[PDB]
Design an enzyme around this catalytic site. Structure first.
Site, PDB file in Angstrom:
ATOM      1  N   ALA A   1       0.822  -1.205   0.000  1.00 32.93           N
ATOM      2  CA  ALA A   1       0.000   0.000   0.000  1.00 32.93           C
ATOM      3  C   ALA A   1       0.858   1.257   0.000  1.00 32.93           C
ATOM      4  CB  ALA A   1      -0.937  -0.001   1.208  1.00 32.93           C
TER       5      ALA A   1
ATOM      6  N   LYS B   1      -1.896 -12.120  -4.793  1.00 33.31           N
ATOM      7  CA  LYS B   1      -1.126 -13.351  -4.738  1.00 33.31           C
ATOM      8  C   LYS B   1      -0.563 -13.551  -3.331  1.00 33.31           C
ATOM      9  CE  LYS B   1       1.836 -14.417  -7.918  1.00 33.31           C
ATOM     10  NZ  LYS B   1       2.944 -14.301  -8.906  1.00 33.31           N
TER      11      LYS B   1
ATOM     12  N   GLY C   1       6.131  -6.397 -14.738  1.00 36.43           N
ATOM     13  CA  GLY C   1       6.428  -5.298 -15.636  1.00 36.43           C
ATOM     14  C   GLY C   1       5.221  -4.444 -15.960  1.00 36.43           C
ATOM     15  N   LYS C   2       5.460  -3.221 -16.438  1.00 39.62           N
ATOM     16  CA  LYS C   2       4.389  -2.274 -16.722  1.00 39.62           C
ATOM     17  C   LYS C   2       3.786  -2.462 -18.103  1.00 39.62           C
ATOM     18  CE  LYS C   2       7.357   1.353 -18.431  1.00 39.62           C
ATOM     19  NZ  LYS C   2       8.629   0.588 -18.566  1.00 39.62           N
TER      20      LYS C   2
ATOM     21  N   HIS D   1       1.172 -16.467 -15.562  1.00 48.03           N
ATOM     22  CA  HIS D   1       1.306 -15.595 -16.727  1.00 48.03           C
ATOM     23  C   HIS D   1       1.579 -16.376 -18.010  1.00 48.03           C
ATOM     24  CE1 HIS D   1       2.981 -11.818 -18.783  1.00 48.03           C
ATOM     25  NE2 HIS D   1       1.732 -11.544 -18.452  1.00 48.03           N
TER      26      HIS D   1
ATOM     27  N   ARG E   1      16.549  -9.441 -21.307  1.00 51.18           N
ATOM     28  CA  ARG E   1      15.220  -9.092 -20.810  1.00 51.18           C
ATOM     29  C   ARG E   1      14.250  -9.239 -21.980  1.00 51.18           C
ATOM     30  NH1 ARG E   1      10.925  -8.585 -18.607  1.00 51.18           N
ATOM     31  NH2 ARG E   1      10.076  -6.750 -17.519  1.00 51.18           N
TER      32      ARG E   1
ATOM     33  N   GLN F   1       6.705  -6.446 -25.284  1.00 51.12           N
ATOM     34  CA  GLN F   1       7.484  -5.556 -24.444  1.00 51.12           C
ATOM     35  C   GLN F   1       7.846  -6.272 -23.142  1.00 51.12           C
ATOM     36  OE1 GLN F   1       8.318  -2.005 -25.272  1.00 51.12           O
ATOM     37  NE2 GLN F   1       7.987  -3.102 -27.204  1.00 51.12           N
TER      38      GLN F   1
ATOM     39  N   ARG G   1      22.262 -18.559 -20.866  1.00 47.66           N
ATOM     40  CA  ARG G   1      20.905 -18.772 -21.348  1.00 47.66           C
ATOM     41  C   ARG G   1      20.156 -19.821 -20.542  1.00 47.66           C
ATOM     42  NH1 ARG G   1      21.659 -21.522 -25.594  1.00 47.66           N
ATOM     43  NH2 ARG G   1      19.392 -21.564 -25.948  1.00 47.66           N
TER      44      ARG G   1
HETATM   45  N1  LIG Z   1       5.322 -10.899  -5.920  1.00 45.69           N
HETATM   46  C1  LIG Z   1       4.201 -11.057  -5.218  1.00 45.69           C
HETATM   47  O1  LIG Z   1       3.463 -12.046  -5.354  1.00 45.69           O
HETATM   48  C2  LIG Z   1       3.829  -9.989  -4.227  1.00 45.69           C
HETATM   49  C3  LIG Z   1       4.636  -8.857  -3.972  1.00 45.69           C
HETATM   50  C4  LIG Z   1       4.207  -7.921  -3.036  1.00 45.69           C
HETATM   51  C5  LIG Z   1       3.008  -8.095  -2.363  1.00 45.69           C
HETATM   52  N2  LIG Z   1       2.242  -9.224  -2.642  1.00 45.69           N
HETATM   53  C6  LIG Z   1       0.948  -9.463  -1.950  1.00 45.69           C
HETATM   54  O2  LIG Z   1       0.368  -8.207  -1.710  1.00 45.69           O
HETATM   55  C7  LIG Z   1      -0.253  -8.222  -0.415  1.00 45.69           C
HETATM   56  C8  LIG Z   1       0.290  -7.048   0.369  1.00 45.69           C
HETATM   57  O3  LIG Z   1       1.584  -7.408   0.875  1.00 45.69           O
HETATM   58  P1  LIG Z   1       2.444  -6.461   1.802  1.00 45.69           P
HETATM   59  O4  LIG Z   1       3.825  -6.380   1.226  1.00 45.69           O
HETATM   60  O5  LIG Z   1       1.769  -5.133   1.901  1.00 45.69           O
HETATM   61  O6  LIG Z   1       2.388  -7.185   3.199  1.00 45.69           O
HETATM   62  P2  LIG Z   1       2.741  -6.730   4.702  1.00 45.69           P
HETATM   63  O7  LIG Z   1       4.113  -6.123   4.714  1.00 45.69           O
HETATM   64  O8  LIG Z   1       2.596  -7.977   5.491  1.00 45.69           O
HETATM   65  O9  LIG Z   1       1.772  -5.722   5.425  1.00 45.69           O
HETATM   66  C9  LIG Z   1       0.496  -5.409   5.012  1.00 45.69           C
HETATM   67  C10 LIG Z   1      -0.280  -5.216   6.272  1.00 45.69           C
HETATM   68  O10 LIG Z   1      -0.879  -6.468   6.685  1.00 45.69           O
HETATM   69  C11 LIG Z   1      -0.918  -6.505   8.110  1.00 45.69           C
HETATM   70  N3  LIG Z   1      -0.336  -7.809   8.454  1.00 45.69           N
HETATM   71  C12 LIG Z   1       0.881  -8.355   7.983  1.00 45.69           C
HETATM   72  N4  LIG Z   1       1.126  -9.593   8.471  1.00 45.69           N
HETATM   73  C13 LIG Z   1       0.018  -9.869   9.288  1.00 45.69           C
HETATM   74  C14 LIG Z   1      -0.339 -10.972  10.072  1.00 45.69           C
HETATM   75  N5  LIG Z   1       0.483 -12.079  10.143  1.00 45.69           N
HETATM   76  N6  LIG Z   1      -1.509 -10.958  10.778  1.00 45.69           N
HETATM   77  C15 LIG Z   1      -2.267  -9.869  10.679  1.00 45.69           C
HETATM   78  N7  LIG Z   1      -2.070  -8.759   9.987  1.00 45.69           N
HETATM   79  C16 LIG Z   1      -0.904  -8.775   9.285  1.00 45.69           C
HETATM   80  C17 LIG Z   1      -0.109  -5.240   8.646  1.00 45.69           C
HETATM   81  O11 LIG Z   1      -0.979  -4.171   9.038  1.00 45.69           O
HETATM   82  P3  LIG Z   1      -1.151  -3.817  10.567  1.00 45.69           P
HETATM   83  O12 LIG Z   1      -0.011  -4.349  11.390  1.00 45.69           O
HETATM   84  O13 LIG Z   1      -1.376  -2.326  10.777  1.00 45.69           O
HETATM   85  O14 LIG Z   1      -2.409  -4.618  10.871  1.00 45.69           O
HETATM   86  C18 LIG Z   1       0.705  -4.884   7.418  1.00 45.69           C
HETATM   87  O15 LIG Z   1       1.051  -3.498   7.389  1.00 45.69           O
HETATM   88  C19 LIG Z   1       0.014  -9.618   0.206  1.00 45.69           C
HETATM   89  O16 LIG Z   1      -1.090 -10.442   0.056  1.00 45.69           O
HETATM   90  C20 LIG Z   1       1.218 -10.117  -0.599  1.00 45.69           C
HETATM   91  O17 LIG Z   1       1.221 -11.487  -0.818  1.00 45.69           O
HETATM   92  C21 LIG Z   1       2.639 -10.145  -3.546  1.00 45.69           C
END
Ligand SMILES: NC(=O)c1ccc[n+]([C@@H]2O[C@H](COP(=O)([O-])OP(=O)(O)OC[C@H]3O[C@@H](n4cnc5c(N)ncnc54)[C@H](OP(=O)(O)O)[C@@H]3O)[C@@H](O)[C@H]2O)c1
Ligand SMILES: NC(=O)c1ccc[n+]([C@@H]2O[C@H](COP(=O)([O-])OP(=O)(O)OC[C@H]3O[C@@H](n4cnc5c(N)ncnc54)[C@H](OP(=O)(O)O)[C@@H]3O)[C@@H](O)[C@H]2O)c1
Lengths: 431, 431
Positions: free
Chosen positions: A17, A144, A177-178, A236, A338, A360, A416
């Site tokens: 966020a 995810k 990617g964008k 993907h 890439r 792209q 590769r």
């Molecule tokens: N490559 C990928 O697949 C990828 C990359 C980035 C993010 N994501 C997904 O995007 C989503 C957001 O991820 P994020 O990076 O923002 O995660 P995050 O760092 O865990 O934090 C998001 C919020 O969730 C709450 N939280 C975290 N762990 C918790 C737990 N064990 N129990 C209860 N509340 C918890 C916290 O808010 P509070 O402490 O204020 O409650 C934290 O600020 C996730 O579902 C993640 O899998 C995926």
């Protein structure tokens, strides 16, 4: 439904966020692409104020001095609610706060769950019980990982799709990617154009490559719990395979296109290890920088990790438009280029000829996805049966890897990939 | 017909024969691609010996010390005859010399006329009267220019095709690079593959570009008597247009493919000046080398020459597979890039998408043509009706240019050409 929308960022105190959701919604607001009467309400356990979120996230906003006034407007349309994720009173506080906004009782509500799926079962429940609008629509954006295998993903998806209809669920994927959405779009248009000639009579082999020149950038700890097949391929690459091999949809409706995609997916048998080549990247001695470090040299990677950073998989669509035509999904990190492309080789009847769709590398594909959620277009979001079919295709292999733990072939940073991948490609007929 | 061939280079004292014909036939002999019992007989007015031709031409042979013995063999299979081009006794001397060779009376005879067409009427007559084999086949290779317009080309072609059948006439064209035949081949295979989708329903515009970055290299005197339309367009670009727009041939026979090519040509109306943009290249002040000199700065170019070094022409195939689909032939010298490509733009039904066939830039395409003459394959040689249709398409325009002498738009050495060409392309619908 009307003019008033409420964007509820569940877990607004998060990293996703802070670094992506708030900046993207700010860019959409500044460029005038959001509805005119839009409110943003963060919700999380951290007792925060809007000023705290502003201080945290505005560094990522591209905040120029010429944009101050509409930036102050955007932040005037922000509010924050502290609460627990399984506390009914907290969700009632959130619902009352939303109702107190201007026409909040009649507004559309877009919940987007910037939370680990480990809490989804709670959140999706309480929302369905306490925070859904009675008049406007309610749409949920889940992130995810959509489960880990057929079983966990079925559990999560059956829970979520017992409280919300399919046209309320938006499984978003936006980390490659964008240009992702535009790549999928050009592949769909290529399917429409070249359809009459994409047969087993003309095509002898299709590849789909996703290539990356950099490694895990010292983030291998997160990648280690998933692998390259879960990271790139069962979501993907499989989806562009669907877009390539699919029949002509009944219309341009999102659900007809997804119907043809799942119809293709239900023709792919379960991949087995003798059609798979896994690989792991090692440090390059002659290189410089991060190229000198390998995958295991990442401090976040556990010692002895056998997870693959490179995968070459062979699949077969089993109808009578494609029969015996091998689809070779080849992807990996820490390579020479890439590149993302699809290439179809023709039957030589006269060397062999190929048709190459290179992909792209305005709305940046992630902004396009938020806008599509706002508009109600579900075409670039995976459906429940689509996801189940993907997991069914890839689950026995993943279980075998987790159980037997085979060492994936080593390849040097900048190469590769392992030569065994080329051997497999040429064994299934590639030239 | 058998094993013995006689390669008669009419005008062996020439520049084409010294710099290209003798070296190419030597390379074909050394690589073992000629028939085992092959003799080479030069014939011209210059009283020369085989040693004179050797001294003249071996500098161009790539003669390495390891190849001495088969080089001596090759020159042992050479002989020379001095004679006039309209003297019956000289042709009788040539015929007797050929008959005196080993099985020369039964050998195939390949006459190749390294002479200006101004003497063809004589040569082709005397050959037909004095030097044709009674047992083996007789094949003639004629060189450009195949006439100058519809009238001169009809005169020459009606004379030649009153003494030899069409399967004995080989109109060779080989001055646009060592990849020509392969480019035409890939375009024919693309026509076979993409045929079902190359319609007026999907295609909105086709281009065919022949681009060259260098100028006349101080050889503008020869180019000045022809022009860019005669040099590149009414022969090569038109022929790949045929290969693109053609129907599926009845078989793989050379005559069926040429039948479909001429069937396409007979659907193109006569191009008019309002669909043509001509251009001439000037020196670039900021460049260096030959880029500082223009076309008129060439000492061999006559002052006041208005001949075009760049042409953009719009044609229309007028059947009901293509109707209103513009074919834009764009070519020129002294440009920004060395490119030859065909590109077909599709109707946007969703920016616009294109299918791009890029062309270059083993047997080097000119060696392939000699080998095709030896084998009897006429597919890469223009037919009489094909040539007549091309000249009919382009003759009124050329006559108007020769009569009114309009100044062709100036463009700078290294540019893409005059902007009026882009204006015309976009007026006929190109985006
Ligand atoms: N490559 C990928 O697949 C990828 C990359 C980035 C993010 N994501 C997904 O995007 C989503 C957001 O991820 P994020 O990076 O923002 O995660 P995050 O760092 O865990 O934090 C998001 C919020 O969730 C709450 N939280 C975290 N762990 C918790 C737990 N064990 N129990 C209860 N509340 C918890 C916290 O808010 P509070 O402490 O204020 O409650 C934290 O600020 C996730 O579902 C993640 O899998 C995926
Ligand atoms: N870009 C092109 O289109 C291109 C490029 C190169 C060549 N060509 C064609 O290839 C052919 C060979 O050309 P080339 O460069 O070898 O020509 P060339 O320099 O004229 O000489 C060839 C031989 O023809 C004889 N000859 C020349 N002019 C004559 C005349 N007015 N009357 C009688 N005999 C004459 C001479 O032999 P003797 O004096 O011993 O009799 C001469 O050695 C020509 O038809 C030419 O058009 C075309």
């Amino acid at each position: 439904q009307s003019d008033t929308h409420i964007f509820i960022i569940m877990g607004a105190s998060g990293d996703l966020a802070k670094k992506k959701i708030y900046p993207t919604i700010w860019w959409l607001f500044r460029d005038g692409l959001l509805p005119e009467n839009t409110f943003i309400v963060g919700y999380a356990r951290s007792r925060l104020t809007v000023a705290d979120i502003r201080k945290q996230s505005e560094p990522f906003f591209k905040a120029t001095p010429e944009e101050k006034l509409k930036l102050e407007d955007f932040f005037a349309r922000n509010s924050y609610v502290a609460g627990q994720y399984d506390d009914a009173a907290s969700y009632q506080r959130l619902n009352s706060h939303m109702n107190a906004l201007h026409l909040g009782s009649q507004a559309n509500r877009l919940f987007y769950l910037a939370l680990p799926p480990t809490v989804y079962e709670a959140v999706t429940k309480n929302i369905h019980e306490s925070c859904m609008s009675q008049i406007g629509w309610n749409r949920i954006i889940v992130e995810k990982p959509f489960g880990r295998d057929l079983q966990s993903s079925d559990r999560l998806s059956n829970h979520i799709s017992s409280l919300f209809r399919e046209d309320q669920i938006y499984r978003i994927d936006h980390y490659l990617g964008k240009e992702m959405v535009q790549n999928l779009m050009v592949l769909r248009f290529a399917n429409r154009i070249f359809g009459p000639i994409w047969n087993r009579d003309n095509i002898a082999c299709v590849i789909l490559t996703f290539k990356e020149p950099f490694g895990t950038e010292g983030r291998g700890g997160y990648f280690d719990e998933f692998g390259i097949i879960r990271d790139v391929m069962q979501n993907h690459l499989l989806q562009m395979l669907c877009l390539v091999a699919m029949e002509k949809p009944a219309s341009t409706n999102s659900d007809d296109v997804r119907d043809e995609k799942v119809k293709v997916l239900k023709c792919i048998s379960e991949v087995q290890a003798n059609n798979v080549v896994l690989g792991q990247y090692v440090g390059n001695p002659d290189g410089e920088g991060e190229a000198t470090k390998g995958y295991l040299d990442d401090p976040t990677v556990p010692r002895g990790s056998t997870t693959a950073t490179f995968a070459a998989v062979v699949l077969y669509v089993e109808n009578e438009r494609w029969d015996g035509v091998p689809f070779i999904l080849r992807c990996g990190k820490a390579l020479n280029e890439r590149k993302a492309e699809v290439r179809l080789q023709f039957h030589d009847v006269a060397k062999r000829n190929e048709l190459v769709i290179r992909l792209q590398p305005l709305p940046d594909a992630y902004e396009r996805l938020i806008l599509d959620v706002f508009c109600g277009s579900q075409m670039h979001f995976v459906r429940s049966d689509e996801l189940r079919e993907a997991w069914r295709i890839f689950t026995p292999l993943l279980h075998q890897i987790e159980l037997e733990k085979p060492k994936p072939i080593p390849y040097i940073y900048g190469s590769r990939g392992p030569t065994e991948a080329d051997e497999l490609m040429k064994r299934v007929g590639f030239q």
